[PDB]
């Protein structure tokens with residue numbers, strides 16, 4: 587253990603995407619990336635991506651021919667995401683993340699489907715998960731940063747702000763920033779190592795524990811935009827809110843959004859409550875317009891799922907600390 591705590595400033599895009607900058611190669615090629623606790627691989631779009639993938643034409647591409655620090659690998663890599671899929675191959679190069687430089691193995695993506703990557707403001711993803719979830723058993727960037735013995739502590743923490751021209755968010759590698767949280771952290775120990783998943787002991791709509799009464803799983807996913815549950819759990823939840831299912835989202839009439847009940851998540855000791863201002867995209871107060879909720883269905887497949895996922899919707903209210911040393915997640919009220 588060292589005495590270094592570095593931070594990555596994040597950009598908040600529409601309260602759904604939070605991305606910072608990383609630099610790959612010599613000289614550095616910069617990419618906008620999402621720091622994802624629900625995955626463990628690093629990947630950026632490749633120059634080897636065909637121009638027929640319209641997503642590739644609209645994102646920064648890594649070119650190994652312009653990097654003197656590049657080391658070829660070539661092993662195939664397929665990443666099947668709950669939202670889509672990416673294929674490419676592995677490569678090793680020097681990666682800079684908040685003043686920390688690490689030699690890192692990552693995927694050069696050559697197949698990037700338009701839907702959903704034409705909606706991505708970010709170029710790629712920096713997986714903040716454990717080696718146990720890394721496709722091709724590639725050493726994750728945080729495990730490589732830990733190995734340097736440069737960090738003050740074996741933790742990293744997230745701050746995600748409400749959309750505004752202010753700070754979008756922040757990741758602190760090696761600690762937590764007290765300027766973005768109040769009170770003290772309440773920890774919840776991980777069920778098992780290998781996943782950033784904890785036990786949840788009930789989801790309540792208002793006063794009545796409407797779901798997860800006999801306990802259920804909660805994945806603390808910085809890479810997920812919304813709060814997610816199973817199709818059955820979300821169907822029951824939305825019926826309790828009066829929410830009408832559209833194709834991809836759930837909506838309410840804009841005028842009845844501020845009246846919607848509080849939603850609570852029973853984790854560790856505490857009840858983590860979100861008011862309707864925390865989960866409704868309150869775009870108007872019109873009885874003639876529809877307002878989307880920041881909760882959606884996601885049937886995650888085993889071993890990880892079925893599970894709930896506490897994404898950006900949760901992290902905006904609760905500043906989150908991911909402790910690798912003690913295999914726990916700490917929450918504090920964000921500020």
Ligand SMILES: CC(C)(C)OC(=O)N[C@@H]1CNC[C@H](C(=O)N(Cc2cccc(Cl)c2Cl)C2CC2)C1
Nearest residue numbers: 620622624625666668669702705706809810811
């Ligand atoms: C099986 C395994 C590979 C581990 O599963 C996962 O990695 N599962 C991922 C877990 N974390 C959320 C990930 C995600 O959905 N996106 C996509 C995304 C989010 C918001 C907006 C857009 Cl446009 C997109 Cl594309 C990645 C950027 C983080 C899926």
Ligand SMILES: *[C@@H]1O[C@H](CO)[C@@H](O)[C@H](O)[C@H]1NC(C)=O
Nearest residue numbers: 658659660661676691723724
């Ligand atoms: C790619 O990386 C892995 C990392 O463990 C290494 O063992 C393997 O030999 C590499 N493959 C090639 C083709 O260089």
